[PDB]
mmCIF file of C-alpha atoms in Angstrom:
data_model
loop_
_atom_site.group_PDB
_atom_site.id
_atom_site.type_symbol
_atom_site.label_atom_id
_atom_site.label_comp_id
_atom_site.label_asym_id
_atom_site.label_seq_id
_atom_site.Cartn_x
_atom_site.Cartn_y
_atom_site.Cartn_z
ATOM 1 C CA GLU A 1 -2.076 -25.311 -11.945
ATOM 2 C CA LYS A 2 -1.635 -21.728 -11.690
ATOM 3 C CA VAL A 3 -1.514 -20.711 -7.960
ATOM 4 C CA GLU A 4 -2.160 -17.282 -6.561
ATOM 5 C CA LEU A 5 0.399 -16.258 -4.187
ATOM 6 C CA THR A 6 0.736 -13.229 -1.849
ATOM 7 C CA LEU A 7 4.369 -12.364 0.205
ATOM 8 C CA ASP A 8 3.977 -13.042 3.489
ATOM 9 C CA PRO A 9 5.201 -10.113 5.549
ATOM 10 C CA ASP A 10 6.124 -11.954 8.764
ATOM 11 C CA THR A 11 9.100 -13.266 6.856
ATOM 12 C CA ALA A 12 10.325 -10.125 4.861
ATOM 13 C CA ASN A 13 13.619 -8.907 5.818
ATOM 14 C CA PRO A 14 12.953 -5.267 7.903
ATOM 15 C CA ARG A 15 14.734 -3.448 5.160
ATOM 16 C CA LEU A 16 12.292 -4.655 2.145
ATOM 17 C CA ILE A 17 9.280 -2.445 0.963
ATOM 18 C CA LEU A 18 6.237 -4.871 0.284
ATOM 19 C CA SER A 19 3.518 -3.449 -1.409
ATOM 20 C CA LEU A 20 0.401 -3.244 0.190
ATOM 21 C CA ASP A 21 -1.479 -6.255 -2.087
ATOM 22 C CA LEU A 22 1.126 -8.390 -1.114
ATOM 23 C CA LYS A 23 2.676 -9.025 -4.540
ATOM 24 C CA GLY A 24 5.197 -6.203 -4.834
ATOM 25 C CA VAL A 25 8.940 -5.999 -3.563
ATOM 26 C CA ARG A 26 11.724 -3.618 -3.367
ATOM 27 C CA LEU A 27 14.379 -2.780 -1.124
ATOM 28 C CA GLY A 28 14.313 0.548 1.025
ATOM 29 C CA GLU A 29 16.890 2.479 2.292
ATOM 30 C CA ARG A 30 16.065 1.767 6.222
ATOM 31 C CA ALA A 31 15.330 -1.523 8.271
ATOM 32 C CA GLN A 32 11.761 -1.062 9.424
ATOM 33 C CA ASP A 33 10.914 -1.786 13.275
ATOM 34 C CA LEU A 34 9.307 -5.237 12.802
ATOM 35 C CA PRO A 35 8.480 -7.743 15.292
ATOM 36 C CA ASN A 36 11.536 -10.183 14.890
ATOM 37 C CA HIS A 37 9.806 -13.411 14.411
ATOM 38 C CA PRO A 38 11.547 -16.796 14.039
ATOM 39 C CA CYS A 39 10.302 -17.065 10.295
ATOM 40 C CA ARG A 40 11.375 -13.125 9.603
ATOM 41 C CA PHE A 41 14.881 -13.304 7.447
ATOM 42 C CA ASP A 42 17.248 -11.025 9.670
ATOM 43 C CA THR A 43 20.131 -10.436 6.919
ATOM 44 C CA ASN A 44 19.315 -11.963 3.316
ATOM 45 C CA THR A 45 17.205 -9.494 1.836
ATOM 46 C CA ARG A 46 14.461 -12.432 1.292
ATOM 47 C CA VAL A 47 10.834 -12.670 1.911
ATOM 48 C CA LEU A 48 8.259 -15.905 1.144
ATOM 49 C CA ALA A 49 5.346 -16.430 -0.121
ATOM 50 C CA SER A 50 2.390 -17.087 2.525
ATOM 51 C CA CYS A 51 1.622 -20.499 0.516
ATOM 52 C CA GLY A 52 4.066 -23.239 0.692
ATOM 53 C CA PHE A 53 3.651 -26.922 -1.295
ATOM 54 C CA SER A 54 3.956 -30.139 -0.241
ATOM 55 C CA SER A 55 2.910 -32.131 -3.403
ATOM 56 C CA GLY A 56 2.065 -31.926 -7.045
ATOM 57 C CA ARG A 57 2.821 -29.295 -9.720
ATOM 58 C CA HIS A 58 2.322 -25.168 -9.598
ATOM 59 C CA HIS A 59 3.511 -22.423 -11.278
ATOM 60 C CA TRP A 60 3.132 -18.648 -10.796
ATOM 61 C CA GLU A 61 4.667 -15.812 -12.807
ATOM 62 C CA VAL A 62 6.965 -13.002 -11.496
ATOM 63 C CA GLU A 63 7.602 -9.328 -12.970
ATOM 64 C CA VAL A 64 11.093 -8.886 -12.913
ATOM 65 C CA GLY A 65 13.022 -4.952 -12.989
ATOM 66 C CA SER A 66 15.331 -4.573 -15.669
ATOM 67 C CA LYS A 67 18.200 -3.261 -12.972
ATOM 68 C CA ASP A 68 20.559 -5.796 -10.705
ATOM 69 C CA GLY A 69 19.831 -6.794 -7.579
ATOM 70 C CA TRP A 70 17.029 -9.328 -7.651
ATOM 71 C CA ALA A 71 16.905 -13.252 -6.968
ATOM 72 C CA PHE A 72 13.471 -15.560 -7.139
ATOM 73 C CA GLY A 73 13.101 -18.791 -7.315
ATOM 74 C CA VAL A 74 11.724 -21.448 -4.361
ATOM 75 C CA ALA A 75 13.181 -22.561 -0.709
ATOM 76 C CA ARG A 76 12.854 -25.676 1.078
ATOM 77 C CA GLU A 77 10.830 -24.080 4.594
ATOM 78 C CA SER A 78 13.845 -24.984 6.483
ATOM 79 C CA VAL A 79 16.041 -22.239 5.011
ATOM 80 C CA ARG A 80 17.711 -20.631 7.706
ATOM 81 C CA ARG A 81 16.167 -17.163 8.217
ATOM 82 C CA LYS A 82 18.817 -16.019 11.168
ATOM 83 C CA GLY A 83 22.260 -14.686 10.281
ATOM 84 C CA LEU A 84 23.967 -14.459 6.810
ATOM 85 C CA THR A 85 22.912 -17.534 4.811
ATOM 86 C CA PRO A 86 25.283 -18.631 1.689
ATOM 87 C CA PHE A 87 22.661 -18.104 -1.226
ATOM 88 C CA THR A 88 23.130 -21.807 -2.666
ATOM 89 C CA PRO A 89 21.014 -25.238 -3.255
ATOM 90 C CA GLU A 90 22.666 -26.383 -0.349
ATOM 91 C CA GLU A 91 21.727 -23.981 2.214
ATOM 92 C CA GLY A 92 18.026 -24.760 0.245
ATOM 93 C CA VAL A 93 17.173 -22.023 -2.016
ATOM 94 C CA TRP A 94 16.578 -22.755 -5.925
ATOM 95 C CA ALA A 95 16.637 -19.451 -7.503
ATOM 96 C CA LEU A 96 17.744 -17.352 -10.726
ATOM 97 C CA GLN A 97 19.174 -13.617 -10.091
ATOM 98 C CA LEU A 98 19.692 -10.932 -12.044
ATOM 99 C CA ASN A 99 23.338 -9.567 -11.345
ATOM 100 C CA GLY A 100 26.201 -7.649 -13.097
ATOM 101 C CA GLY A 101 23.627 -7.059 -16.052
ATOM 102 C CA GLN A 102 23.647 -10.465 -16.797
ATOM 103 C CA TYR A 103 21.224 -13.342 -15.424
ATOM 104 C CA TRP A 104 22.561 -16.476 -13.429
ATOM 105 C CA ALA A 105 21.322 -19.721 -12.011
ATOM 106 C CA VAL A 106 22.511 -19.544 -8.541
ATOM 107 C CA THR A 107 24.327 -23.150 -8.580
ATOM 108 C CA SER A 108 27.019 -23.845 -6.405
ATOM 109 C CA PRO A 109 30.015 -23.597 -5.774
ATOM 110 C CA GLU A 110 30.315 -21.383 -9.016
ATOM 111 C CA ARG A 111 26.687 -19.357 -10.071
ATOM 112 C CA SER A 112 26.005 -20.641 -13.753
ATOM 113 C CA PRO A 113 24.973 -17.720 -16.766
ATOM 114 C CA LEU A 114 22.180 -18.251 -18.586
ATOM 115 C CA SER A 115 22.346 -16.427 -22.246
ATOM 116 C CA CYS A 116 18.750 -15.511 -22.549
ATOM 117 C CA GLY A 117 17.651 -12.279 -23.742
ATOM 118 C CA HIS A 118 16.213 -9.298 -21.414
ATOM 119 C CA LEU A 119 13.781 -10.718 -18.856
ATOM 120 C CA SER A 120 10.766 -9.125 -18.248
ATOM 121 C CA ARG A 121 8.229 -11.792 -16.501
ATOM 122 C CA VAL A 122 8.875 -15.309 -15.811
ATOM 123 C CA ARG A 123 6.746 -18.585 -15.214
ATOM 124 C CA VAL A 124 8.184 -20.123 -12.220
ATOM 125 C CA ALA A 125 6.945 -24.115 -12.381
ATOM 126 C CA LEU A 126 7.428 -26.075 -9.468
ATOM 127 C CA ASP A 127 6.829 -29.863 -9.989
ATOM 128 C CA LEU A 128 7.407 -31.572 -6.688
ATOM 129 C CA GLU A 129 6.721 -35.310 -8.223
ATOM 130 C CA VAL A 130 9.434 -35.238 -10.760
ATOM 131 C CA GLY A 131 11.760 -32.781 -8.390
ATOM 132 C CA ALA A 132 12.222 -29.622 -10.367
ATOM 133 C CA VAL A 133 11.561 -26.043 -10.695
ATOM 134 C CA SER A 134 11.837 -24.894 -14.212
ATOM 135 C CA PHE A 135 11.859 -21.156 -15.055
ATOM 136 C CA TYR A 136 10.390 -20.144 -18.342
ATOM 137 C CA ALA A 137 10.612 -16.628 -20.134
ATOM 138 C CA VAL A 138 6.572 -15.920 -20.414
ATOM 139 C CA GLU A 139 7.258 -14.307 -23.905
ATOM 140 C CA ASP A 140 7.197 -17.650 -25.963
ATOM 141 C CA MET A 141 7.311 -19.626 -22.890
ATOM 142 C CA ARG A 142 11.330 -20.070 -23.527
ATOM 143 C CA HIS A 143 13.049 -22.635 -21.065
ATOM 144 C CA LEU A 144 15.735 -20.764 -19.021
ATOM 145 C CA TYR A 145 16.554 -23.073 -16.368
ATOM 146 C CA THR A 146 15.747 -25.779 -14.099
ATOM 147 C CA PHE A 147 16.946 -27.070 -10.933
ATOM 148 C CA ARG A 148 16.398 -31.018 -10.067
ATOM 149 C CA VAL A 149 15.830 -31.486 -6.557
ATOM 150 C CA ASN A 150 14.639 -34.606 -4.704
ATOM 151 C CA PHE A 151 12.306 -32.051 -2.507
ATOM 152 C CA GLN A 152 11.676 -33.694 0.634
ATOM 153 C CA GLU A 153 9.739 -30.997 2.713
ATOM 154 C CA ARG A 154 7.498 -28.345 2.137
ATOM 155 C CA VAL A 155 8.699 -25.533 -0.740
ATOM 156 C CA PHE A 156 7.946 -22.016 -0.881
ATOM 157 C CA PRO A 157 8.185 -19.488 -3.315
ATOM 158 C CA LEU A 158 11.208 -17.059 -2.525
ATOM 159 C CA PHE A 159 11.842 -13.637 -3.308
ATOM 160 C CA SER A 160 14.939 -11.229 -2.753
ATOM 161 C CA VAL A 161 15.960 -7.629 -4.007
ATOM 162 C CA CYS A 162 19.231 -7.095 -2.155
ATOM 163 C CA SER A 163 19.985 -3.510 -4.306
ATOM 164 C CA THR A 164 17.429 -0.470 -4.534
ATOM 165 C CA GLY A 165 15.956 0.567 -7.624
ATOM 166 C CA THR A 166 14.940 -2.894 -8.963
ATOM 167 C CA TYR A 167 11.830 -5.020 -7.860
ATOM 168 C CA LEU A 168 9.862 -7.945 -8.422
ATOM 169 C CA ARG A 169 6.031 -8.537 -8.401
ATOM 170 C CA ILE A 170 4.247 -11.509 -8.661
ATOM 171 C CA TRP A 171 1.509 -11.379 -11.987
ATOM 172 C CA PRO A 172 -0.583 -10.172 -12.404
ATOM 173 C CA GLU B 1 5.706 20.783 13.607
ATOM 174 C CA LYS B 2 7.192 17.864 12.021
ATOM 175 C CA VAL B 3 4.081 15.727 11.383
ATOM 176 C CA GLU B 4 4.126 11.727 10.937
ATOM 177 C CA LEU B 5 1.948 10.965 8.233
ATOM 178 C CA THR B 6 0.817 7.657 6.481
ATOM 179 C CA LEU B 7 -1.203 7.098 3.390
ATOM 180 C CA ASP B 8 -5.049 6.559 3.616
ATOM 181 C CA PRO B 9 -5.520 3.127 1.516
ATOM 182 C CA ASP B 10 -9.443 3.900 1.397
ATOM 183 C CA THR B 11 -8.694 6.905 -0.529
ATOM 184 C CA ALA B 12 -6.509 5.643 -3.188
ATOM 185 C CA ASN B 13 -7.277 5.270 -7.179
ATOM 186 C CA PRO B 14 -7.294 1.594 -7.213
ATOM 187 C CA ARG B 15 -4.974 1.795 -9.931
ATOM 188 C CA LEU B 16 -2.087 2.906 -7.290
ATOM 189 C CA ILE B 17 -0.045 0.565 -5.552
ATOM 190 C CA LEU B 18 0.619 1.736 -1.888
ATOM 191 C CA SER B 19 3.713 0.629 -0.080
ATOM 192 C CA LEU B 20 2.521 -2.174 2.949
ATOM 193 C CA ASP B 21 4.148 0.684 5.556
ATOM 194 C CA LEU B 22 1.485 3.353 3.694
ATOM 195 C CA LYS B 23 4.396 5.737 2.918
ATOM 196 C CA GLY B 24 4.946 5.109 -0.799
ATOM 197 C CA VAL B 25 3.041 5.116 -3.999
ATOM 198 C CA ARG B 26 3.763 4.369 -7.414
ATOM 199 C CA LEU B 27 0.907 3.602 -10.507
ATOM 200 C CA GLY B 28 0.443 0.072 -11.474
ATOM 201 C CA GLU B 29 -0.740 -1.322 -14.714
ATOM 202 C CA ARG B 30 -4.383 -2.550 -13.368
ATOM 203 C CA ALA B 31 -6.903 -1.313 -11.278
ATOM 204 C CA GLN B 32 -6.958 -3.613 -8.042
ATOM 205 C CA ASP B 33 -10.461 -4.443 -6.977
ATOM 206 C CA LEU B 34 -11.031 -2.474 -4.105
ATOM 207 C CA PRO B 35 -14.109 -1.301 -2.355
ATOM 208 C CA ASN B 36 -15.662 1.766 -3.414
ATOM 209 C CA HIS B 37 -15.893 3.794 -0.486
ATOM 210 C CA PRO B 38 -16.996 7.547 -1.169
ATOM 211 C CA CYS B 39 -13.540 8.772 0.017
ATOM 212 C CA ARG B 40 -11.926 6.873 -3.216
ATOM 213 C CA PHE B 41 -10.412 9.091 -5.686
ATOM 214 C CA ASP B 42 -12.097 6.961 -8.772
ATOM 215 C CA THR B 43 -10.437 8.760 -11.398
ATOM 216 C CA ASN B 44 -7.666 10.819 -11.122
ATOM 217 C CA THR B 45 -4.756 9.151 -10.040
ATOM 218 C CA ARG B 46 -4.816 10.349 -6.034
ATOM 219 C CA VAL B 47 -4.035 9.519 -2.368
ATOM 220 C CA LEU B 48 -4.649 11.675 0.693
ATOM 221 C CA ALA B 49 -2.660 11.101 3.500
ATOM 222 C CA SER B 50 -5.172 9.843 6.619
ATOM 223 C CA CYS B 51 -3.969 12.964 8.472
ATOM 224 C CA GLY B 52 -6.461 16.348 8.234
ATOM 225 C CA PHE B 53 -5.326 19.769 9.663
ATOM 226 C CA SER B 54 -7.796 22.307 10.657
ATOM 227 C CA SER B 55 -5.230 24.995 12.054
ATOM 228 C CA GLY B 56 -1.788 25.582 13.170
ATOM 229 C CA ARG B 57 1.630 24.918 11.744
ATOM 230 C CA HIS B 58 3.091 21.652 10.024
ATOM 231 C CA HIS B 59 5.874 20.074 7.814
ATOM 232 C CA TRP B 60 6.464 16.874 6.381
ATOM 233 C CA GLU B 61 9.019 15.627 3.554
ATOM 234 C CA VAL B 62 8.464 13.710 0.198
ATOM 235 C CA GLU B 63 10.936 11.717 -1.836
ATOM 236 C CA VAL B 64 10.418 12.188 -5.353
ATOM 237 C CA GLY B 65 10.947 9.797 -8.272
ATOM 238 C CA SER B 66 13.127 11.242 -11.381
ATOM 239 C CA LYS B 67 10.901 10.362 -14.146
ATOM 240 C CA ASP B 68 7.436 12.629 -15.106
ATOM 241 C CA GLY B 69 4.181 11.593 -13.539
ATOM 242 C CA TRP B 70 3.815 12.791 -9.870
ATOM 243 C CA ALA B 71 2.400 15.672 -8.355
ATOM 244 C CA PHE B 72 2.009 16.327 -4.440
ATOM 245 C CA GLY B 73 0.621 18.960 -2.267
ATOM 246 C CA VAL B 74 -2.054 19.397 -0.029
ATOM 247 C CA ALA B 75 -6.074 19.309 -0.865
ATOM 248 C CA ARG B 76 -9.292 20.351 0.742
ATOM 249 C CA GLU B 77 -11.418 17.920 2.187
ATOM 250 C CA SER B 78 -14.098 18.540 -0.001
ATOM 251 C CA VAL B 79 -11.906 17.794 -3.313
ATOM 252 C CA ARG B 80 -13.979 15.730 -5.455
ATOM 253 C CA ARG B 81 -13.457 12.028 -5.503
ATOM 254 C CA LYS B 82 -15.828 10.867 -8.386
ATOM 255 C CA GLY B 83 -15.155 11.388 -11.740
ATOM 256 C CA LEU B 84 -12.507 13.224 -13.601
ATOM 257 C CA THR B 85 -11.487 16.231 -11.379
ATOM 258 C CA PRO B 86 -9.591 19.436 -13.021
ATOM 259 C CA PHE B 87 -6.348 19.614 -11.415
ATOM 260 C CA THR B 88 -6.431 23.206 -10.237
ATOM 261 C CA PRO B 89 -6.427 25.016 -6.804
ATOM 262 C CA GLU B 90 -10.254 25.966 -7.651
ATOM 263 C CA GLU B 91 -11.046 22.205 -8.007
ATOM 264 C CA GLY B 92 -9.007 22.141 -4.216
ATOM 265 C CA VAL B 93 -5.791 21.266 -4.707
ATOM 266 C CA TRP B 94 -2.307 22.925 -3.853
ATOM 267 C CA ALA B 95 0.390 21.041 -5.625
ATOM 268 C CA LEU B 96 3.726 20.647 -7.232
ATOM 269 C CA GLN B 97 4.473 18.232 -10.079
ATOM 270 C CA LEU B 98 6.979 16.670 -12.350
ATOM 271 C CA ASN B 99 5.791 16.726 -16.264
ATOM 272 C CA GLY B 100 7.508 16.855 -19.334
ATOM 273 C CA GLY B 101 10.916 16.922 -17.392
ATOM 274 C CA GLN B 102 9.823 19.949 -16.035
ATOM 275 C CA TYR B 103 8.862 20.964 -12.400
ATOM 276 C CA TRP B 104 5.456 23.229 -11.842
ATOM 277 C CA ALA B 105 3.609 24.590 -9.446
ATOM 278 C CA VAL B 106 -0.075 23.441 -10.748
ATOM 279 C CA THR B 107 -1.759 26.867 -10.990
ATOM 280 C CA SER B 108 -4.323 28.045 -13.108
ATOM 281 C CA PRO B 109 -5.093 28.659 -15.695
ATOM 282 C CA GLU B 110 -1.732 28.102 -16.732
ATOM 283 C CA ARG B 111 0.960 26.329 -14.838
ATOM 284 C CA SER B 112 3.979 27.737 -13.486
ATOM 285 C CA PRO B 113 7.481 26.343 -14.367
ATOM 286 C CA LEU B 114 9.688 26.440 -11.210
ATOM 287 C CA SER B 115 13.386 26.593 -12.273
ATOM 288 C CA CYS B 116 14.759 24.457 -9.426
ATOM 289 C CA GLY B 117 17.228 22.012 -9.911
ATOM 290 C CA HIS B 118 17.043 18.356 -9.698
ATOM 291 C CA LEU B 119 14.655 17.508 -6.469
ATOM 292 C CA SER B 120 15.238 14.466 -4.614
ATOM 293 C CA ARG B 121 13.188 15.144 -1.284
ATOM 294 C CA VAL B 122 10.785 17.925 -1.055
ATOM 295 C CA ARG B 123 9.866 19.880 2.458
ATOM 296 C CA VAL B 124 5.991 21.044 2.586
ATOM 297 C CA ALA B 125 5.046 23.401 5.088
ATOM 298 C CA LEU B 126 1.433 24.143 5.275
ATOM 299 C CA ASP B 127 1.000 27.201 7.438
ATOM 300 C CA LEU B 128 -3.191 27.446 8.441
ATOM 301 C CA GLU B 129 -3.146 30.593 10.388
ATOM 302 C CA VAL B 130 -1.128 32.518 7.531
ATOM 303 C CA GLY B 131 -2.734 30.689 4.723
ATOM 304 C CA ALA B 132 -0.028 28.905 3.036
ATOM 305 C CA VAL B 133 1.413 25.651 1.619
ATOM 306 C CA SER B 134 4.744 25.704 0.797
ATOM 307 C CA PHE B 135 7.861 23.927 -0.447
ATOM 308 C CA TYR B 136 11.305 23.368 -0.030
ATOM 309 C CA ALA B 137 13.940 21.534 -1.475
ATOM 310 C CA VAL B 138 15.850 19.617 1.412
ATOM 311 C CA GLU B 139 19.542 19.888 0.479
ATOM 312 C CA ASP B 140 19.626 23.448 1.317
ATOM 313 C CA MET B 141 15.916 24.110 2.521
ATOM 314 C CA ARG B 142 15.598 26.750 -0.658
ATOM 315 C CA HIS B 143 12.541 27.673 -1.393
ATOM 316 C CA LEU B 144 10.545 26.368 -4.512
ATOM 317 C CA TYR B 145 7.005 27.733 -4.319
ATOM 318 C CA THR B 146 4.146 29.043 -2.122
ATOM 319 C CA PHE B 147 0.134 29.034 -2.789
ATOM 320 C CA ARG B 148 -1.496 31.451 -0.644
ATOM 321 C CA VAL B 149 -4.782 30.200 0.338
ATOM 322 C CA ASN B 150 -7.877 31.447 2.764
ATOM 323 C CA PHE B 151 -8.338 27.488 4.227
ATOM 324 C CA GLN B 152 -11.612 27.260 5.658
ATOM 325 C CA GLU B 153 -11.298 23.297 5.920
ATOM 326 C CA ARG B 154 -9.459 20.379 6.954
ATOM 327 C CA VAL B 155 -6.760 20.116 4.822
ATOM 328 C CA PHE B 156 -4.918 16.810 3.901
ATOM 329 C CA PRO B 157 -1.556 15.835 2.337
ATOM 330 C CA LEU B 158 -2.274 15.148 -1.005
ATOM 331 C CA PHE B 159 -0.217 12.504 -3.844
ATOM 332 C CA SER B 160 -0.781 11.671 -7.413
ATOM 333 C CA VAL B 161 0.900 9.275 -9.570
ATOM 334 C CA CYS B 162 -0.108 9.360 -13.233
ATOM 335 C CA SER B 163 2.706 7.615 -14.853
ATOM 336 C CA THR B 164 3.923 4.378 -14.321
ATOM 337 C CA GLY B 165 8.144 4.249 -13.751
ATOM 338 C CA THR B 166 8.033 7.100 -11.144
ATOM 339 C CA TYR B 167 6.904 7.364 -7.252
ATOM 340 C CA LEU B 168 6.752 9.273 -4.204
ATOM 341 C CA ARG B 169 7.259 8.407 -0.744
ATOM 342 C CA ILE B 170 6.357 10.191 2.381
ATOM 343 C CA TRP B 171 10.230 10.649 4.421
ATOM 344 C CA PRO B 172 11.745 8.943 6.270
#
């Protein structure tokens, strides 16, 4: 089921720059002076969508920048918000990443290089019955990667941008 | 006098993407579904700041993208909002522009090429006593261009982005 997502500004790392329509995210140079709510990521360059999922099957699409520094997928609600959090499935995030000109599934203890082509837009499919989060290149809906997870709590779309000069945008 | 400006989202052309903090603007691929206020530019890719000036001297700074398609400066309040408006001083806009890899003052009937070097951040100085809008490269505060105008109404900072892949941002 196609879901309409917006980014939740109360969760955003204060250095992120969200779009006014709450679909786009980049990294800024300077931390904004924002309320330091418990839900806000204070160190990792993350933001969640405002909608989380507890059951069923849902998908959404993400337009992705060509330059390094993004990662996106899903996170369990209980993901640590405060302090530098390892970027690993055990720490509650399941994500693809562009880093070093290369795409990765962010597995642990080593990340998993994908050898897909250039990515412009990616469909994320979450299946909470089967326990999967899957990524597809939209052009031909080619499968890129699936994490298999016995999700036991509410799961949120997750977006991260840790370098200037790239972006992610919930599409359309 | 240094002024703290924010973009006025009610004036923004619906294809523009404003930042949530109302300082940055880029052009999106698709028009958003926005309330068609009288103040909103419906055709030209323009947005005003929320603050207008009637007297005195004021300045602000604008971070600028390296790629073509931006223009910024000031507009008289009576600038036409509805329909395709010529981009000329006589139509109430006084601006610098990056187009064709070149910087221009948007004079009429012909634009005026500047021969400055690469611009990253530009200071706009508005002097309503003397009737001037001036542009400086911030690095060395080198004068780029001044328009002389007998302003007889409120003057608003003006920003325009007519190509994807570039941006402007009120700084810092």
